[PDB]
UniProtKB/Swiss-Prot annotation, chain D:
The keyword Phosphoprotein applies. It comes from Homo sapiens. The modification Phosphoserine is found at residues 9, 49, 56. Glycans are attached at residue 185. Component of the 20S core proteasome complex involved in the proteolytic degradation of most intracellular proteins. This complex plays numerous essential roles within the cell by associating with different regulatory particles. Associated with two 19S regulatory particles, forms the 26S proteasome and thus participates in the ATP-dependent degradation of ubiquitinated proteins. Pfam families: Proteasome (PF00227), Proteasome_A_N (PF10584). It is found in: Cytoplasm; Nucleus. This is Proteasome subunit alpha type-5.
UniProtKB/Swiss-Prot annotation, chain E:
Sumoylated by UBE2I in response to MEKK1-mediated stimuli. The lineage of its organism: Eukaryota, Metazoa, Chordata, Craniata, Vertebrata. It is found in: Cytoplasm; Nucleus. The gene is PSMC3. The chain holds residues 242 to 439 of 439 of the full protein. Component of the 26S proteasome, a multiprotein complex involved in the ATP-dependent degradation of ubiquitinated proteins. This complex plays a key role in the maintenance of protein homeostasis by removing misfolded or damaged proteins, which could impair cellular functions, and by removing proteins whose functions are no longer required. Therefore, the proteasome participates in numerous cellular processes, including cell cycle progression, apoptosis, or DNA damage repair. The modification Phosphoserine is found at residue 135. It comes from Homo sapiens (Human). Belongs to the AAA ATPase family. Component of the 19S proteasome regulatory particle complex. The 26S proteasome consists of a 20S core particle (CP) and two 19S regulatory subunits (RP). The regulatory particle is made of a lid composed of 9 subunits, a base containing 6 ATPases including PSMC3 and few additional components. Interacts with PAAF1. This is 26S proteasome regulatory subunit 6A.
UniProtKB/Swiss-Prot annotation, chain G:
The keyword Signal does not apply. Keywords: Acetylation, ATP-binding, Cytoplasm, Nucleotide-binding, Nucleus, Phosphoprotein, Proteasome. The modification Phosphoserine is found at residue 12. GO terms for cellular component: blood microparticle; cytoplasm; cytoplasmic vesicle; cytosol; cytosolic proteasome complex; extracellular exosome; inclusion body; membrane. Component of the 26S proteasome, a multiprotein complex involved in the ATP-dependent degradation of ubiquitinated proteins. This complex plays a key role in the maintenance of protein homeostasis by removing misfolded or damaged proteins, which could impair cellular functions, and by removing proteins whose functions are no longer required. Therefore, the proteasome participates in numerous cellular processes, including cell cycle progression, apoptosis, or DNA damage repair. Belongs to the AAA ATPase family. It comes from Homo sapiens. One of its GO terms (molecular function) is general transcription initiation factor binding. This is 26S proteasome regulatory subunit 8. The modification N6-acetyllysine is found at residue 114. It is found in: Cytoplasm; Nucleus. ATP binds at residues 82-89. The keyword Nucleotide-binding applies.
From Swiss-Prot, chain H:
There is a cross-link at residue 167 (Glycyl lysine isopeptide (Lys-Gly) (interchain with G-Cter in ubiquitin)). Residues 20-34 are annotated as: Disordered. It comes from Homo sapiens (Human). The gene is PSMC1. SMART domains: AAA. The modification N6-acetyllysine is found at residue 188. Residues 21-33 have a biased composition (Basic and acidic residues). The lineage of its organism: Eukaryota, Metazoa, Chordata, Craniata, Vertebrata. Component of the 26S proteasome, a multiprotein complex involved in the ATP-dependent degradation of ubiquitinated proteins. This complex plays a key role in the maintenance of protein homeostasis by removing misfolded or damaged proteins, which could impair cellular functions, and by removing proteins whose functions are no longer required. Therefore, the proteasome participates in numerous cellular processes, including cell cycle progression, apoptosis, or DNA damage repair. GO terms for molecular function: ATP binding; ATP hydrolysis activity; proteasome-activating activity; RNA binding. It comes from the Eukaryota. Pfam families: AAA, AAA_lid_3, Prot_ATP_ID_OB_C. It is found in: Cytoplasm; Nucleus; Membrane. SUPFAM superfamilies: P-loop containing nucleoside triphosphate hydrolases. This is 26S proteasome regulatory subunit 4. It is a lipid-anchor.
């Protein structure tokens, strides 16, 4: 699945609540983790991810900031672009054909929906397009009712008048 | 510019005198692939351990930027070096007593 | 089934001929020197950071590997192993042998001219003032320092050129190169158009480092528009790599112990859009320009483009020069070649002045008035 | 940039007037020479088709009984200016019982040769040669689109005007005669033209103080052509 | 030439390099090398090559230039101050630069350069003509009073072109008309346009 | 300097919309016109009858007076407005000086209106070019043409619209001295022009005549079939 | 072989053995694409355009002899035009499937350019993968893509080798692509794409709904007349989210009221009046 | 019936193409070569039998040459043969025949020769005496001593035969042909145009006398893309590099440069001036008589009845091209296989006529004009 939207709408927070109320194995993945000093560590790291994902369970992985990996443009002469390119290819070839039955759930999440290759947002790869939009007048009231329950709150101060 | 944004943190660096990791944030990137990311991991581990640490990163805008439509190639690793900070300042494992003091020329 | 038969069985006879030929088929120059050169040595080349005091103790990174404290072999000149000087270093012992001249560039050594084109001053007629002043600038101090130093005056290091396209900037630049007696260097103004940031700085570096070693040399810039026009400022960050390349060219051109004994001839076809940092003199002194051939210099260009062809002697030249006031020497060359081609269309061997009439009344009408086409009176 | 008549240059100048001076150049040539015997004048017609009737294209028009004209550039701006001069001359004779002298004619034309204005239209695209005889003998007058009017003794206009002025200053002096100036002018015409000179290519306009009427030559111009 | 401190030069575009981050290395090692030879006078040439009013935009932007500039500024001033650095910078234009490049005392004494009003023109002509052999029938004050708004290099061009204008004759030392024709070359910018102005 | 607007020149001294507005005429329908000695005749091509409507409203040849005849090219609306204005101009001239209207004065009117219409502020010039045929002064046949710049330009024969260079080039090889009159040879001259037309479909030909004294006569598509038959007979006699 | 792995010894660098299973480059670009693989049984609701592209593509393939017998020049570029969602890509994929031609979709990526050559200088190394894989059908999307197509069609028209090399571009807005591109000796069969009509939407519904788990008792023409015209892949979303509507009520059978909710779910595509004007 | 000889000759050709010690000194030179004959790249050449090479990753050595293969073969920027044991330069490697050659250097004389023209026979004579006569028979330049004309420009309406004449000069040829479409000279990087110019014309200048043909060169001045970095201040740099390339220095060489445009008005006056281009060549749509020659040639190898006159296809349309007549032929073939006949009759020509004149030449929806 894919999360995006105005960033600050709790994109991490739903993954927080899911990971707290999940049951199976949960892997968080830093999006910027894969580009590292050793020349070739990345494909083995993606294989580590997906072999463990098939290995455990119908489990859950949450990969945030995949914009660090998903960048549509490269330059195949710098050298450093080519490892990012083959990390994307490693991800692609091991995404379409997992087992069709091992229910690995990879939650991808960015804020920017511009620097993503349309070869990534495909049927079978990422079917749903889910944003976290900004709240409105009543959702902010509900958010205030949730958050202000922890403070002691001198009870004749109304906060709806700031919504 | 020139309102003494540096010297106020320097006065804090003459008040608490505990663990001021004053990163100038321009001499971080050198040439290599993932070296800057590893330096960021190192700073965050070191700040995690020596429990009262003060993170200070002056002149952020060189290493910050905003975003691009994918122009110069070095800007890719710039944005990954920035997303290093964007993840591990928040992550899932929340920081504790890791107080970050930030200063800019144009925010 | 005639041509079909013909192609089919002729190629079949060919293939059957080939089948029985496919079945019918079934030094001392320097070798001992080479076996004496297996006792030669591999001699890996390197780069030097610095020496030490009172003892060599040389500190070297190879180019890639690491950095080492090495010591020279005893067969060196123990003086000329200085810093930044690329030297050859032994594989096992890491001992140093001989310094050799350094990395020049992968493709910037490839713009020295290495020949001399046979463009001569005699072919550049009609610009006698330009000829004599260019003579004075370039040819005189670099071959005959007779009057300049002996009174105590300086020669000008810089000369700019422009004019109508087709006037002889190419001619004068190639015309020096016949009688250069100097290390002439060609520089396209589009050479500074690279992909990577600050690379043109390195280009200016290696240009002037080729200029300094060999003495009394020429460097020719050409089409310096792409080198940069001005120092534009806007909220988008446009012409920057070109701009820094331009300013680095200004600095390593002149200033803070300047160039030395180099003369640079610059050319452009749009001098008005140049920054004053190039336009201020000392950097470039004599702003020599080109005009159109207005007079019998046209007839002299006629005599140049006609002296290499066997013609009718009964002809004049000033008549067509009257018929071409605004024209360029390139257009003169086109007309002369075109009239010669008209004579080669005929089975003659000598042209006519009427062949020149054909060339004029064909080029200047068909390809100075049909481009673009008028289909409208409105005027006449 | 330069985009309009209401904006100077950093150095000068219009930059619309300049393009009007450039739009002089496209036209056919014409040559007039002032001689104290009288003003002679010539033009090229540049006939395209044989269907193109040669006496229909106007180059020398008649403003007054002793004042000729010649046009160079856009035909219809010239027609407007000729129309206005034809009005104004008649008003001068009306209000004064006399002939408006040709310098005053040209001041009247150049009053709104530049009155170009679209608010509070474009500047005109023709240069004009005026020949006439005032009280001071014959007068030959040369104006421009920019209204900078001056007297010229023998002015050439239009295409190939450079070598025309060159060979003209080659041959001219102050004390020329009539037919000599006529043949001297048509020599320069057949040097600057591309076609064979004949009865249909050029036309002459001769005004004299004793021969004020009929500032034209009709098919005796053939006889003038055949004398070269 | 006059003082004898450890003097150090620096060009603008020599700092920005093809790779990302080498300018930080270069400026930091330059400050180190100058600081280890404490009477240190740093000369900076074309700061406006690397000094830029930076910009926030999208789709484009050249970043590393500001990285080397912020390296220069922070290792120049602010936290970790130094006492032994002396700075000389020279630009041709002004308002390209950030205000954080100067502000008061990133560079302290804001010093413009005037052009020779009248008298310094004859002074500069005297200076560069000191080497030439002159038949001294020359009022330099005439020449300074006619040549309006030249630099020192244009007066030098006057001097040298006057020398070779005398060498067109080639016989003798300098004359006044040699200086006149040197002016007449250095003067224009030729216009001569003229039209519509009667 | 640009294709906008009409008011500024080119840097090499041109007007773009004056030059460009003639292209709308040059992509327009073809209409020729010649003068005889006594009978003048003209016609348009490309009647283009689209099988389900009437075509008496699309007539491109009309008159302002009984002595003058019209044609045009380019777009039809500008021709409609210019002719509707020109009728009132002809009648206002008749309300003045009591002559039959000379062809020269009304051409000066139309071209002058077109030009001072062009000079003004942002008015799209009439992309037409009219053919103005009349024989007034003792039956002297005259035909002038116009221009989007507004230059009347007197001819003896004329051809505009699509491929006008070739159609005019036929009249170069056709128009000898002894054309007319000889009215029958002027008739066959119009017929040879229609046969030399860019399509020459045979039924899409529409031609109108004037004998300098009568009215405008619209012909019949059987007389023209006889004309094409005798022209093919002349082509066979050339063999 | 060119570009084949082999077993090479390490000491003396002597050849040991041939290694199989070399590269799969076109398979790699295909897996970059993952186009919807199709056949004839799913583009129902219309067969006219199917017969057109049969006549213009299968007939060059199956019968070059019929073209070369009378001596005609075969067509080589078929420009397609139409609104999105009318099967602008399912069509060409089902054509290339039922003729066994190598299907190619060069869209816009540096992945693509790096696998054609090394993204080096141009795209004309696709011609290398065109001739050597001679049953080639190349597909393009909606002014740069047209410029690349202009390069390709400026070489392949008669200044190249053996055919079955035909390209297909399907977009909308016909006039913004070049008119020299639409020179009639360059592009022949401009084939329109219709919006799906009532029976056509019915057939699209029957295809995209036939393979699901319906309620015993269902109607389809009512649903087909609910839509005033959808795309092709909107009806699929109707069907699958009607299945979602069935599963949120803990059922595996799909009544009509699931479709009554799914029609309203997709209905938010267009609404909004006080805009009749027109 | 000709399939038998076709298949048999094709198989014989392939098998005979697939049909590809005594010397002891040569074997000693083999043994001076290593068994792992490694490969490197040169930097500089020093006269003392050894020079400096570079490895794959960047090690560099002073290594000597096996001198039976010449060092005059060696130039800076070549791929060489190196040893493992002393890394000595072993010999010359055949060069990287880069995809610039395999794309651009068309080995093939493409199609029909000068008998595939229409409305020609002056411009053929111009391109002949301006390219072929400098190529094949330049003895007349001995006889007079005059430069050949340099550049050629083909311009006119779309579908005139720019493509056809470009294929014609490449048909009768003996020199290496190069072909560039003018839309290629903008890439998604800063400064990729001049690199293309320099490497293109260097490869043009290195092999032999040659011909460079570029077509639709007008697509660089009047075209903008969102796929463009920098922009006009890089288009101008591309133009300026090609400007210095075409009319530069150093005896440019026997490389005839031939260009072809649709429009002519939006082009640099500094590039149509002579010195660069000496033979501008008009392509008008020539005449209504050689319409019949193109109908003759494009139906010279198809069975057709009489049943038509080409005068019916002369008096239909006012602008004429091979793009007209070949479209008529192909659409007539479509109507022929539509009605499963041969010996094409008149009604195919009539419906093909109407459908080709409509698609496309009308302009624009009614009306306008009419
Ligand atoms: N609906 C909500 N109810 C309660 N608290 C909320 C709600 N939405 C947001 N918050 C609070 O605001 C925070 C949202 O920011 P995050 O969850 O950190 O999202 P994120 O990591 O910032 O994603 P970004 O913006 O791309 S870095 C949460 O940590 C909560 O403290
Ligand atoms: N005075 C002249 N005498 C002889 N040949 C001339 C003369 N002027 C120009 N030419 C010819 O014109 C060309 C001279 O090169 P130019 O066209 O002047 O190159 P250029 O001056 O750099 O113009 P650019 O490149 O547009 S700035 C050659 O073909 C010369 O033979």
């Amino acid at each position: 699945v894919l999360m995006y939207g105005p960033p600050g709408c709790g994109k991490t927070m739903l993954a927080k609540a899911v990971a707290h109320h999940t049951t199976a194995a949960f892997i968080r993945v830093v999006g910027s983790e894969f580009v590292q000093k050793y020349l070739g560590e990345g494909p083995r790291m993606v294989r580590d991810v997906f072999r463990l994902a098939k290995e455990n369970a119908p489990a859950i992985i949450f990969i945030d900031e995949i914009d660090a990996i998903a960048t549509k443009r490269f330059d195949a002469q710098t050298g450093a672009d080519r490892e990012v390119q083959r990390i994307l290819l490693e991800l692609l070839n091991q995404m379409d054909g997992f087992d069709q039955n091992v229910n690995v759930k990879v939650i991808m999440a960015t804020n920017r929906a511009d620097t993503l290759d349309p070869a990534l947002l495909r049927p079978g790869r990422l079917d749903r397009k889910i944003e976290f939009p900004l709240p409105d007048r009543r959702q902010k009231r509900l958010i205030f009712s949730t958050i202000t329950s922890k403070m002691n709150l001198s009870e004749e101060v109304d906060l709806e008048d700031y919504v | 510019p020139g309102t003494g944004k540096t010297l106020l943190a320097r006065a804090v660096a003459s008040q608490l005198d505990c663990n001021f990791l004053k990163v100038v944030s321009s001499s971080i990137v050198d040439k290599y692939i993932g070296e800057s990311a590893r330096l960021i991991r190192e700073m965050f581990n070191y700040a995690r351990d020596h429990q009262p640490c003060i993170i200070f990163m002056d002149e952020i805008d060189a290493i910050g930027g905003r975003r691009f439509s994918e122009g110069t190639s070095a800007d890719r690793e710039i944005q990954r070096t920035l997303m290093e900070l964007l993840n591990q300042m928040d992550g899932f494992d929340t920081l504790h007593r890791v107080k970050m003091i930030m200063a800019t020329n144009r925010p | 089934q005639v041509e079909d038969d013909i192609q089919q069985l002729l190629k079949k006879i060919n293939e059957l001929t080939g089948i029985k030929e496919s079945d019918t088929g079934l030094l001392a120059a320097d070798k001992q020197t080479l076996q004496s050169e297996q006792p030669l040595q591999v001699a890996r080349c390197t780069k030097i950071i610095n020496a030490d005091s009172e003892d060599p103790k040389y500190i070297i990174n190879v180019k890639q590997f690491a950095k080492f404290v090495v010591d020279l072999s005893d067969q060196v000149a123990p003086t000329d192993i200085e810093e930044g000087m690329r030297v050859g270093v032994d594989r096992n012992k890491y001992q140093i042998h001989i310094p050799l001249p350094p990395k020049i560039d992968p493709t910037v050594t490839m713009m020295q001219v290495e020949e001399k084109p046979d463009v001569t001053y005699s072919d550049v007629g009609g610009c006698k003032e330009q000829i004599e002043k260019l003579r004075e600038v370039v040819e005189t101090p670099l071959l005959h320092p007779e009057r300049f130093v002996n009174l105590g005056i300086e020669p000008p290091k810089g000369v700019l050129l422009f004019g109508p396209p087709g006037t002889g900037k190419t001619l004068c630049a190639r015309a020096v190169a016949n009688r250069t007696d100097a290390c002439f260097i060609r520089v396209i103004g589009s050479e500074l158009v690279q992909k990577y940031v600050g690379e043109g700085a390195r280009m200016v570096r290696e240009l002037f480092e080729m200029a300094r070693t060999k003495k009394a040399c020429l460097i020719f810039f050409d089409e310096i528009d792409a080198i940069g026009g001005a120092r534009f400022d806007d909220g988008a960050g446009g012409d920057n790599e070109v701009q820094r390349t331009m300013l680095e060219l200004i600095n390593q051109l002149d200033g803070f112990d300047p160039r030395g004994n180099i003369k640079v001839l610059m050319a452009t076809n749009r001098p008005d859009t140049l920054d004053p940092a190039l336009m201020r003199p000392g950097r470039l002194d004599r702003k020599i320009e080109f005009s159109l051939p207005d007079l019998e210099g046209r007839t002299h260009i006629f005599k140049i483009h006609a002296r290499s062809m066997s013609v009718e002697r009964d002809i004049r030249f000033e008549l067509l020069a009257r018929l071409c006031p605004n024209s360029t020497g390139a257009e003169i060359r086109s007309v002369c070649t075109e009239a010669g081609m008209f004579a080669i269309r005929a089975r003659r061997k000598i042209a006519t002045e009427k062949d020149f009439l054909e060339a004029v009344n064909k080029v200047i009408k068909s390809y100075a008035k049909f481009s673009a086409t008028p289909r409208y009176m409105t005027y006449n | 940039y330069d985009r309009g008549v209401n904006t100077f240059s950093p150095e000068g100048r219009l930059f619309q007037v300049e393009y009007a001076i450039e739009a002089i150049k496209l036209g056919s040539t014409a040559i007039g020479i002032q001689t104290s015997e009288g003003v002679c004048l010539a033009v090229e017609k540049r006939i395209t088709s044989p269907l193109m009737e040669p006496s229909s294209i106007e180059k020398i028009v008649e403003i007054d009984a002793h004042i000729g004209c010649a046009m160079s550039g856009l035909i219809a701006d010239a027609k407007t200016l000729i129309d206005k001069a034809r009005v104004e001359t008649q008003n001068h004779w009306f209000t004064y019982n006399e002939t408006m002298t040709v310098e005053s004619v040209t001041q009247a034309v150049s009053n709104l040769a530049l009155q170009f204005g679209e608010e509070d239209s474009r500047p005109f695209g023709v240069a004009l040669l005026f020949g006439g005889v005032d009280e001071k003998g014959p007068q030959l007058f040369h104006m421009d689109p920019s209204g900078t009017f001056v007297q010229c003794d023998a002015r050439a206009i239009g295409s190939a005007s450079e070598g025309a002025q060159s060979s003209l200053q080659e041959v001219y002096h102050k004390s020329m005669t009539l037919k000599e100036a006529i043949k001297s002018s048509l020599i320069i015409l057949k040097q600057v033209m591309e076609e064979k000179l004949n009865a249909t290519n050029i036309e002459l306009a001769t005004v004299q103080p004793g021969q004020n009427f009929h500032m034209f030559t009709k098919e005796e111009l053939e006889e003038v052509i055949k004398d070269i | 030439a006059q003082t004898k401190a450890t003097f150090l030069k620096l060009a603008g575009p020599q700092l920005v390099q093809m790779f990302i981050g080498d300018g930080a290395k270069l400026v930091r090692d330059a400050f180190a090398l100058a600081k280890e030879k404490a009477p240190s006078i740093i000369f900076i040439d074309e700061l406006d090559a690397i000094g830029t009013k930076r910009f926030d935009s999208e789709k484009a932007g050249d970043r590393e230039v500001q990285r080397t500039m912020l390296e220069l500024l922070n290792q120049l001033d602010g936290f970790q101050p130094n006492t032994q650095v002396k700075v000389i910078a020279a630009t041709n234009r002004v308002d390209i630069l950030d205000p954080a490049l100067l502000r008061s005392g990133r560079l302290d004494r804001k010093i413009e350069f005037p052009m020779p009003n009248e008298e310094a023109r004859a002074r500069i002509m005297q200076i560069h003509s000191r080497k030439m052999n002159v038949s001294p029938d020359v009022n330099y004050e005439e020449l300074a009073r006619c040549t309006d708004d030249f630099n020192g290099a244009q007066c030098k061009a006057v001097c040298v072109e006057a020398g070779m204008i005398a060498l067109r004759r080639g016989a003798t030392e300098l004359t006044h008309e040699d200086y006149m024709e040197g002016i007449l070359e250095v003067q224009a910018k030729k216009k001569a346009n003229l039209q519509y102005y009667a | 300097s640009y294709d906008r607007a009409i008011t500024v020149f080119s840097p090499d001294g041109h007007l773009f919309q004056v030059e460009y507005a003639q292209e709308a005429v040059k992509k327009g329908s073809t209409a020729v016109g010649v003068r005889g000695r006594d009978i003048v005749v003209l016609g348009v091509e490309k009647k283009s009858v689209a099988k389900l409507q009437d075509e008496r409203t699309v007539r491109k040849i009309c008159a302002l007076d009984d002595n003058v005849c019209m044609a045009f090219a380019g777009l039809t609306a500008d021709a409609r407005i210019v002719i509707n204005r020109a009728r009132v101009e002809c009648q206002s001239h008749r309300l003045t000086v009591e002559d039959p209207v000379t062809v020269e004065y009304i051409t000066r009117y139309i071209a002058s209106l077109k030009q001072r219409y062009t000079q003004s502020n942002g008015r799209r010039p009439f992309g037409i070019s009219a053919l103005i045929v009349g024989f007034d002064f003792d039956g002297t046949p005259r035909l002038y043409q116009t221009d989007p710049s507004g230059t009347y330009h007197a001819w003896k024969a004329n051809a505009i619209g699509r491929g006008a260079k070739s159609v005019r080039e036929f009249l170069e090889k056709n128009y000898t001295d002894e054309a007319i009159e000889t009215d029958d040879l002027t008739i066959k001259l119009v017929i040879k022009a229609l046969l030399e037309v860019v399509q020459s479909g045979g039924k899409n030909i529409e031609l109108a005549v004037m004998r300098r004294d009568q009215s405008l006569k619209i012909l019949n598509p059987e007389e023209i079939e006889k004309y094409v038959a005798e022209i093919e007979k002349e082509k066979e006699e050339n063999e | 072989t060119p570009n084949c792995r082999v077993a090479l010894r390490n000491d003396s660098y002597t050849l040991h053995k041939i290694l199989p299973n070399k590269v799969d480059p076109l398979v790699s670009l295909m897996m970059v694409e993952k186009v919807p693989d199709s056949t004839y049984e799913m583009i129902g609701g219309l067969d006219k355009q199917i017969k057109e592209i049969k006549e213009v593509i299968e007939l060059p393939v199956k019968h070059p002899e019929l073209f070369e017998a009378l001596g005609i020049a075969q067509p080589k570029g078929v420009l397609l035009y139409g609104p999105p969602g009318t099967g602008k890509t399912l069509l060409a994929r089902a054509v290339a499937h039922h003729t066994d031609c190598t299907f190619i979709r060069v869209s816009g990526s540096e992945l693509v350019q790096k696998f054609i050559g090394e993204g080096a200088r141009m795209v004309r190394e696709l011609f290398v993968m065109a001739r050597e894989h001679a049953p080639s059908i190349i597909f393009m999307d909606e002014s740069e893509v047209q410029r690349t197509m202009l390069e390709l069609l400026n070489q392949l028209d008669g200044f190249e080798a053996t055919k079955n090399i035909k390209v297909i571009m399907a977009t909308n807005r016909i006039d913004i692509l070049d008119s020299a591109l639409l020179r009639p000796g360059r592009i022949d069969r401009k084939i329109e794409f219709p919006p799906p009509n009532e029976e056509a939407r019915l057939d699209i519904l029957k295809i995209h709904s036939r393979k699901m788990n319906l309620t015993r008792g269902i109607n389809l023409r009512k649903i087909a007349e609910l839509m005033p015209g959808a795309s092709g892949a909107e009806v699929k979303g109707v069907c699958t989210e009607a299945g979602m509507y069935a599963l949120r009520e803990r059922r595996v059978h799909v009544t009509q009221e699931d479709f009554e909710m799914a029609v309203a779910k997709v209905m938010q595509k267009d609404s909004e009046k006080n805009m009749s004007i027109k | 019936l000709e399939r038998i000889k076709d298949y048999l000759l094709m198989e014989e050709e392939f098998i005979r193409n697939q049909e590809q010690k005594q010397e002891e000194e040569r074997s000693k030179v083999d043994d001076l070569r290593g068994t792992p004959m490694s490969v490197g790249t040169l930097e500089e050449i020093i006269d003392d039998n050894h020079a400096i090479v570079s490895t794959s990753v960047g090690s560099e050595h002073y290594v000597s040459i096996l001198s039976f293969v010449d060092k005059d073969l060696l130039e800076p920027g070549c791929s060489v043969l190196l040893n493992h044991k002393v890394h000595a330069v072993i010999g010359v490697l055949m060069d990287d025949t880069d995809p610039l050659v395999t794309v651009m250097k068309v080995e093939k004389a493409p199609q029909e020769t000068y008998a595939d023209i229409g409305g020609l026979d002056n411009q053929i004579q111009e391109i002949k005496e301006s390219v072929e006569l400098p190529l094949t028979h330049p003895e007349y330049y001995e006889e007079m001593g005059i430069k050949p004309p340099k550049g050629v420009i083909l311009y006119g309406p779309p579908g005139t035969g720019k493509t056809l004449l470009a294929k014609a000069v490449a048909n009768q040829t003996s020199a290496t042909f190069l072909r560039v479409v003018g839309s290629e000279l903008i890439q998604k990087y800063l400064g990729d145009g001049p690199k293309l110019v320099r490497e293109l014309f260097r490869v043009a200048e290195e092999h032999a006398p040659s011909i460079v043909f570029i077509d639709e060169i007008d697509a660089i001045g009047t075209k903008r893309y969102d796929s463009n970095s920098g922009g006009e201040r890089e288009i101008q740099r591309t133009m300026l590099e090609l400007l210095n390339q075409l009319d530069g220095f150093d005896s440019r060489g026997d490389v005839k440069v031939i260009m072809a445009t649709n429009r002519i008005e939006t082009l640099d006056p500094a590039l149509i001036r002579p010195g660069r281009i000496d033979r501008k060549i008009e392509f008008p749509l020539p005449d209504e008589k050689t319409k019949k020659r193109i109908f003759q040639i494009h139906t010279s190898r198809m069975t057709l009845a009489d049943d038509v006159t080409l005068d019916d296809l002369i008096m239909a349309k006012d602008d004429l091209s091979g793009a007209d007549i070949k479209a008529i032929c192909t659409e007539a073939g479509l109507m022929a296989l539509r009605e499963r006949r041969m010996k094409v009759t008149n009604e195919d020509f009539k419906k093909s006529k109407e459908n080709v004149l409509y698609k496309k030449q009308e302009g624009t929806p009614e009306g306008l004009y009419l």
